[PDB]
Symmetry: D2
Subunit: 265 residues, 4 copies
């Protein structure tokens, strides 16, 4: 008789796990993750902020790149998240242990993080990672400030209930650069219609496309860089083809609408 199946690891494309050196995005903001997963380090006079960390096994690489940027582990003040899936929040528990950083997140992200991504609305227990606690619960539009740099949360539920865009204003060449780190707008394999675990999924996505269109933004980044047409591997040309917020929302909505019709079909 067949035994029960073995547990299956969450495996990803090699490029998601390919380390890169820090890539400067603006005067204080650096991509310090892998070629295909965003992890943004914002360096202030009173400590650093990390927005996402990628996969669980990226924790050491993140700390190495922080050190290259002059940031010792204890200099990391704050971790912010796009959403609490294993490929973006993976190393949060380990980073908290090794740095003392606090995590700020909305209540939906906090509850998913605290169960390590288990009992996911769509993926069940297939993408579990080490659980972590949120130290500060934030509300829509709330401002979190480190070293004078203000980060504003914009809720954009859909990909997860707690999906969040973060905005802040950096500089380049003496001019302001409004950065928008917008969350995923994909629905990979999701049951969109009549989903008992997420009854208003379609209404939330539709509002979130509108929220993304309206973000203050001179430079858009996304957890998966390809979603906004970044290419981290080509250095100073990485941002050349990057989408606007309007274009990112439009592409996501077209995909969503096509998926909805295919689900009907």
């Amino acid at each position: 008789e067949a035994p029960l199946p073995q547990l299956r690891a969450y495996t990803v494309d090699a490029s998601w796990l390919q380390p890169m050196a820090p890539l400067q995005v603006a005067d204080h903001t650096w991509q310090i993750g892998t070629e295909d997963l965003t992890a943004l380090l914002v360096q202030t006079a009173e400590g650093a902020v990390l927005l996402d960390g990628g996969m669980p096994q990226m924790a050491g690489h993140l700390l190495d790149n922080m050190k290259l940027r002059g940031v010792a582990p204890q200099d990391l003040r704050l971790i912010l998240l796009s959403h609490a899936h294993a490929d973006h929040a993976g190393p949060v528990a380990e980073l908290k242990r090794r740095t003392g950083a606090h995590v700020a997140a909305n209540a939906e992200t906090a509850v998913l993080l605290a169960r390590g991504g288990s009992n996911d609305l769509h993926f069940g227990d297939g993408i579990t990672y080490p659980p972590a606690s949120a130290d500060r619960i934030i509300m829509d539009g709330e401002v979190v400030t480190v070293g004078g740099i203000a980060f504003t949360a914009h809720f954009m539920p859909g990909h997860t209930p707690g999906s969040t865009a973060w905005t802040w204003t950096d500089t380049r060449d003496g001019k302001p650069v409004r950065i928008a780190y917008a969350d995923s707008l994909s629905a990979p394999g999701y049951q969109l219609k009549g989903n008992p675990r997420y009854p208003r999924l379609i209404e939330d996505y539709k509002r979130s496309f509108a929220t993304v269109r309206a973000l203050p933004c001179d430079l858009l980044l996304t957890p998966h860089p390809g979603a906004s047409n970044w290419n981290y591997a080509v250095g100073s040309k990485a941002s050349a083809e990057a989408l606007t917020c309007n274009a990112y929302a439009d592409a996501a909505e077209k995909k969503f609408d096509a998926q909805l019709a295919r689900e009907t079909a």
Copy 2:
């Protein structure tokens, strides 16, 4: 020199703590709280549901009234909440310990419940109560079913971020009675405008008035019975003057608008 102040207890009007015998609302639904705090018991063939419990010190009274209704402690399957303030969720931890019931709540209510109402957006630590955990996180529009009776959640944020209306269809005289247990729409002493802890407070309240207007409803009940013009003390006449959902939302919005203008003034 003045010592630091003593801790101050959360004290309430005597009528909020005045026990009453069970008052039948419909064929399966009973008010089993106090004269001025709602606690609804819905009795099914496969166990009971409790919607709110009132103040922390009401736990024993609730269990006594459950016993009068034929419900032993272990027959309580499920606890649902309007919102996780001390005067509505107060006895949840004790009820879970004594009954084995599970709690279902949205993520905002879950995080407030788990910190016992401390660090409230408006009240600070003044209304702390024993913390409890949510066993099931629910989404807007999600259906929770016990003994075939379906309870639907309708999020109506404002009074708390996690404020929820619950609807279900009971019977009376062979006819359906659509019951709506709508949450508080008050903002007592709240800073409404430009509140850093709740930046979209006004937009949430305005949407919640609309949500309440649209609830399926033949009989409205509220956590504070006076908010919907119930009078639990007068028995079979308790519901006589009860408001419609439209009237409840209208009265709440008029009060809110007046408060907003007074806050401006």
Copy 3:
């Protein structure tokens, strides 16, 4: 350049995942796990108790065997644990969701369970499973009662800080059968001496051997049946070769002492 390694699944011997039909241990007590992982169902007039659940993927099998025994999911009242490693507590979160059972455990087991086995003192993040909460914290010697059957906890730290033996008295042929479900006493790959994460590891194991020797016991069972010389696959002869508590403790201490000397060498 090498990408970072993929996540690695916790894989186990096939026999640990080999389903078996319920095997009666005494009048109310049944082995309902797999050939090589113990999961004990104790059936009372007022609901059932489950002691351990095995691997995460065993949840459905456990519920199937409960149904064969006449126990519907909602009839499971209580889950007790030997220790909160993935191969014994694996399916607890799912079982709680599907049955409404409460978990009772000591504080050490509760904290490890709530982090899903991550940040293990010896195994790091290699054996993470879905986190779950303990509904009742128990103390050493505390009695937990379901349907009149009293289960007594005996702390035996070492294999994990929260390792616990559970004892209860069942019957067979009109005579009492004192059952002892003693936890693992292995230290697989552990650094025993001068371990910064567990400074008193050796003293705890030494006391735990003594605790096991002294347990009230006519029939010993262990989370890994082979540790007490059970063979679940041979049905009515499964218990024939089972060790006494004295013999189990002696074998474990001999292995431990040999390992200590090898660690010195």
Copy 4:
């Protein structure tokens, strides 16, 4: 008919709430609490450690005294606890929010802290305070290091299951001063014998008296300064009459034995 009683605040002697200026204990160690509640600040080159915080309403006073010592809120790295009762752990949640400090505690202290002191083994819900999470779980004998200063945990269960002594070596006049911050050994109003919630209470206290006798110690301090014959109000003479560890343990055991006999009587 009598309404249910109002909630009752946890009120304490005025001297427990009487602020004092920082009182130097050794070269890096300061009493910064109130006249009758200990809160120790240990200042290192890489941040500060706080051992206990007193009552919930002491948070602002603690931060004021930290500022007098040159310690900005963000310079507080670590909070350690004797035990998680409201009069010693009261302000921990607020301190974490305002400083970013992490809490290190054993599993028993962590679970009591996370429920805000509610469902206390002896006091029920009478001494609840705002819940907080432990960021690091520590084991008996484990060393926690900040700025090169090593703090060692010594478990001494009884007053609470998680009661802990902390030891570290400071200096004065060029010579080492071994400081022992030993927890409470009182059992105020406790049922000592046959306590179902704490079956091995007497055995734990008896071992804890022995643990305290054996602590490395040139200068003993206790959460209630009077328990070790300190008098914080008389400045440079505050330590003059302080007990040794042997004397503190002896006095506590004599009181305990007398209480046990009175409980028998």
